[PDB]
Amino acid sequence: KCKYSFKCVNSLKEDHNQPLFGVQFNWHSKEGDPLVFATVGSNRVTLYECHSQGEIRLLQSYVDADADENFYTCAWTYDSNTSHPLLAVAGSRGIIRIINPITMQCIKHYVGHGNAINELKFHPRDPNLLLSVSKDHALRLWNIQTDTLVAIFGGVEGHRDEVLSADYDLLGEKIMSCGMDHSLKLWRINSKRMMNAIKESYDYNPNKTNRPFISQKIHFPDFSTRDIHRNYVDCVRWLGDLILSKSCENAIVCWKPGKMEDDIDKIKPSESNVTILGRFDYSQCDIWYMRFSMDFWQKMLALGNQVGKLYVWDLEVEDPHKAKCTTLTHHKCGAAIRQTSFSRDSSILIAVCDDASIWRWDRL
């Protein structure tokens, strides 16, 4: 049985009136510091602070110089030298921008993807390792300290259509990607080749040599399946050694590669089997581009639907049918919830929508 209860304490509409596709709390902020989250939509990136009595304090608004840009994703990191926070954002233009959130200045950018970027994720152990996933059918791993492209995951056995999502595992030893080709692909980054590629990007000095940095071209994933969903896979996240992924069939599928007892670290690249462990059912979330999320401790799972309902499950409950919490609903929240974010201490849950609204749910 699930215990988690929430109450809607606040809501606001952003002045641009454009759909909000991303929301992320800054989980790098030290215990005691104000809870900050970013939202993206249109060519806008907007930062907010969460205060008592449900207050949402507007800090700064970054407006891209390109009025045609459509941001689809953002991720937080920190400068490993100065401990200064950083925000990476991307979208339609297929360009990654590292913005100083304090000043709203675009510090640097990364060109290279042949089409739009659907997701950005920072490595959990190394704040300089940024993963980008694209409509160009590939994933790219960047080292934002040395400004290098470490690797490109795509090619011969790479994704055959647009990549929609990806997630590092907890320790950052591997990545699971998913896209329009209905497949979920595994890419190990703890392999001797990839760890050496990572080390090399760090030793690269452009004021020492005139030769450009050579990225790895990873043509072959460490596992592949199109046996879980019957359509586009638009969201994937790791749950320990297990995988959570969704399509349009109103269920988040919990699965693992190989047979039931198979160790994630022992599955061979040719493994043709998969094991479906359960499903988190919901309704009216059959349209493309809806992200699900988990809190830091992975005790909670949240997913918004097309009609403004926000589903939450307790991941400490073994049966996914008994894991369901009370559906978070407000009569004024009727637009598609594209993404949600829990604050690091999971005390606040923010939902962002198609009608530019932000909804704040506080844990009771």
């Binding site: 800054n26 989980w27 790098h28 902020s29 030290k30 215990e31 510091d33 104000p34 900050v36 930062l47 800090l59 920190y78 100065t82 401990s83 200064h84 926070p85 959130p101 304090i102 959990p124 152990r125 907890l170 320790l171 749950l239 320990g240 050694d241 297990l242 039931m260 462990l277 830091f296 401790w297 992975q298 400490e316 073994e318």
Partner: peptide, 29 residues
């Protein structure tokens, strides 16, 4: 069984990440 074993792996690995977060002091925004 497989559930309790997965939860422990999440417990142990989030505790590793939590200890690294605790050991740093990221500037306020």
């Amino acid at each position: 069984s497989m559930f309790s074993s997965n939860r422990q792996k999440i417990l142990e690995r989030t505790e590793i990440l939590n200890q690294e977060w605790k050991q740093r002091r990221i500037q306020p925004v």
